[PDB]
Amino acid sequence: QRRRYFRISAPLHPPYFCQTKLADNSTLRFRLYDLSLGGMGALLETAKPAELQEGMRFAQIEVNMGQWGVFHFDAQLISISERKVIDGKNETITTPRLSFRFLNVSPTVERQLQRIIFSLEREAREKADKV
Numbered sequence: 597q598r599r600r601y602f603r604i605s606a607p608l609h610p611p612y613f614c615q616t617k618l619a620d621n622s623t624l625r626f627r628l629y630d631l632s633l634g635g636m637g638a639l640l641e642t643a644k645p646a647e648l649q650e651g652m653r654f655a656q657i658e659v660n661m662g663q664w665g666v667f668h669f670d671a672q673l674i675s676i677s678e679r680k681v682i683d684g685k686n687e688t689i690t691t692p693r694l695s696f697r698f699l700n701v702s703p704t705v706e707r708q709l710q711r712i713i714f715s716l717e718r719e720a721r722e723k724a725d726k727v
């Protein structure tokens with residue numbers, strides 16, 4: 597059991613979007629992939645900007661969970677990897693996968709993270725709730 601916490605997968609069909617500012621003052625946007633009490637995974641839209649790389653620390657990333665609310669978390673970018681899917685044209689499409697570790701997780705921050713996690717479990721149980 598290498599992972600300390602259970603990670604809940606987010607729906608990409610109705611994707612949830614996050615964003616944060618870079619040192620060059622540009623905005624970075626990415627789709628929420630999965631979430632846990634320890635961090636989160638996300639998918640980039642474009643190819644990774646040169647500025648983006650592992651080790652960067654972010655203050656109050658805006659995670660917009662739709663009806664469930666908007667949240668802001670500190671996090672450290674731990675790893676940039678590749679997510680691959682098979683095209684509708686039967687082509688392999690590579691896009692950057694981000695792995696974050698949450699920082700400064702006060703007792704109230706994890707309060708919020710559990711709120712989001714249960715909402716995602718209830719939701720995904722409705723995704724499978726329909727044959």
Ligand SMILES: Nc1nc2c(ncn2[C@@H]2O[C@@H]3COP(=O)(O)O[C@H]4[C@@H](O)[C@H](n5cnc6c(=O)[nH]c(N)nc65)O[C@@H]4COP(=O)(O)O[C@H]3[C@H]2O)c(=O)[nH]1
Pocket residue numbers: 597598599674675677693695
């Ligand atoms: N540094 C760092 N990078 C992370 C972390 N979590 C995810 N990543 C990166 O994101 C890639 C895809 O993660 P995944 O969707 O959970 O997909 C994972 C997951 O489904 C499974 N897997 C790998 N390790 C574990 C594990 O320790 N526990 C569990 N339950 N599953 C694992 O194998 C798949 C491929 O694993 P990878 O080749 O390692 O590829 C991983 C890795 O490069 C992390 O905590 N730290």
Ligand SMILES: Nc1nc2c(ncn2[C@@H]2O[C@@H]3COP(=O)(O)O[C@H]4[C@@H](O)[C@H](n5cnc6c(=O)[nH]c(N)nc65)O[C@@H]4COP(=O)(O)O[C@H]3[C@H]2O)c(=O)[nH]1
Pocket residue numbers: 598599600601603630631632633634635636637638674694695696697698
């Ligand atoms: N939801 C989510 N959280 C993320 C992701 N990336 C990092 N984190 C969070 O950051 C914590 C520390 O990551 P680490 O230093 O790379 O240290 C990680 C990493 O070295 C290894 N590990 C776990 N899962 C994977 C994986 O899927 N791939 C690889 N390569 N390593 C993994 O186990 C260590 C501890 O794992 P955790 O207890 O889960 O604790 C992880 C996790 O809570 C992510 O993509 N999604």
